[PDB]
């Protein structure tokens, strides 16, 4: 409305909105895809792989 300048280095764009980059919710699954108990039923054992986890 009150246009004027609408340019300071901050608090112009910050009062409008800063741009969203992080969104903090369920992309590492929980209680919808994982938290599983509905697995298979067959011959049994050894799919338990073990990683290096160095990263």
């Amino acid at each position: 409305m009150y246009e004027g300048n609408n340019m300071r280095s901050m608090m112009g764009t910050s009062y409008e909105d800063s741009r969203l980059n992080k969104r903090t919710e369920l992309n590492e699954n929980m209680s919808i895809d994982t938290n599983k108990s509905e697995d298979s039923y067959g011959v049994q054992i050894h799919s338990l792989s073990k990683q290096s986890f160095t990263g």
Binding site: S37, E38, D39, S49, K50
Partner: protein, 392 residues
């Protein structure tokens, strides 16, 4: 139980024998012969009562005895000794208190962390000496002697493998009992209750839970929390064989909607998962019958006067000896009603089997060949993953 049979008196003369020819620096050097009579003995036949009895058949039963843990074996390089791992501990968000002074921006809040320094493994060793002089007094075929020389060699690897699974089993059970939280242990009351507490301990490993791990036993994590989940493609259940047998014959066979909730794909099982012993109080060796008991399990190098450190591992039934009572305690659950539901990738296991068959030493003074087998095995458990114990 006194015998005056002449053939039994001939057998009873231990002066004539293969042993006193090979005990002493000098011995008799010719044989006049002995009258062998099969009459009134175990060896008696009808038509010919005067020959020495015959073997036609000599077996060597063999069994290969696998490992049940070597999918976890990472072939390392065996260089360096100290390995390390760490996590960055959780810091909860705090409220915006705008009444604080503005130089709070300039104060640094360093991220704190929790490490765990492991160390080396154990170079393990076993040898076997095959003789060319007195082993050949048995084995009436050369093929039987070569089968023997091979069967000893193939038994050495079989009781490498069963030793490594006894040590992995004992590592997991000793880590369940002596290290843990108050949160991790549960108390079952029966076999019907534990088989459901196992089912509801899964679905607890895969929540965002600051409990269920042991970062309070990590180096920097004595104060603070750390949250971890699992994925159920990583959960291992370590039970006795009674519990897995009970699941498979009763709980699965008495339900109708088994198509979803069968967790026995993730269950390793042992018939009796305590047979391995530890040291307390740091004794030493002084009795002769104790080391003669040790020699039967292959341990050649221990003499009298050797000391045993405060954390050594014995791996066979050893607590009956005169020295070891009070010093040696068994790694076992006290109830045979046991379930340790842990995360895989919490069990690091790096062995090194490259320079393993080392070249033999022909010992031609005694005309014998010793073969050695050396391997370096590192096994440890990380404190940064979710674990639940269910026991009494």
């Amino acid at each position: 139980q006194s015998t005056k049979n002449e053939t039994a008196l001939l057998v009873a003369k231990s002066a004539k024998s293969a042993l006193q020819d090979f005990n002493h620096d000098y011995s008799k050097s010719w044989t006049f012969g002995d009258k062998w009579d099969n009459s009134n003995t175990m060896f008696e036949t009808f038509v010919n009562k005067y020959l020495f009895p015959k073997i036609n058949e000599t077996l060597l039963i063999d069994i290969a005895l696998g490992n049940r843990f070597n999918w976890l074996a990472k072939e390392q390089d065996f260089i360096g000794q100290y390995s390390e791992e760490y996590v960055i501990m959780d810091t909860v968000p705090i409220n915006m208190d705008l009444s604080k002074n503005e130089e709070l921006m300039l104060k640094r809040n360093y991220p704190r962390m929790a490490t765990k320094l492991y160390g080396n493994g154990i170079v393990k060793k076993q040898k076997f000496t095959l003789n060319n002089n007195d082993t050949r007094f048995n084995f009436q075929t050369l093929a039987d002697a070569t089968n023997y020389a091979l069967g000893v060699y193939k038994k050495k690897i079989s009781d490498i493998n069963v030793l490594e699974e006894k040590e992995m089993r004992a590592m997991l059970v000793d880590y369940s009992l002596n290290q843990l939280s108050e949160t991790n242990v549960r108390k079952a009351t029966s076999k019907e209750d534990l088989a459901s507490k196992v089912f509801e301990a899964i679905l607890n490993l895969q929540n965002n839970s600051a409990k269920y791990n042991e970062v309070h036993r990590a180096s920097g994590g004595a104060i603070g929390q750390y949250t971890t989940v699992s994925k159920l493609k990583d959960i291992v259940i370590l039970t006795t064989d009674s519990l897995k047998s009970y699941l498979l014959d009763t709980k699965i066979a008495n339900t109708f909607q088994i198509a979803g909730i069968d967790f026995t794909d993730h269950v390793i099982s042992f018939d009796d998962l305590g047979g391995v012993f530890k040291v307390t109080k740091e004794f030493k060796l002084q009795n002769q019958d104790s080391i003669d008991f040790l020699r039967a399990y292959g341990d050649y190098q221990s003499q009298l006067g050797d000391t045993i450190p405060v954390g050594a591992v014995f791996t066979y039934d050893v607590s009956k000896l005169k020295e070891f009572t009070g010093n040696v305690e068994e790694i076992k659950p006290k109830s045979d009603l046991y379930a340790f539901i842990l995360d895989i990738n919490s069990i690091k296991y790096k062995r090194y089997t490259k320079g393993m068959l080392k070249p033999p030493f022909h010992n031609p003074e005694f005309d014998e060949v010793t073969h050695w087998i050396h391997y370096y095995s590192f096994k440890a458990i990380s404190p940064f993953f979710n674990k639940i114990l269910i026991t009494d």
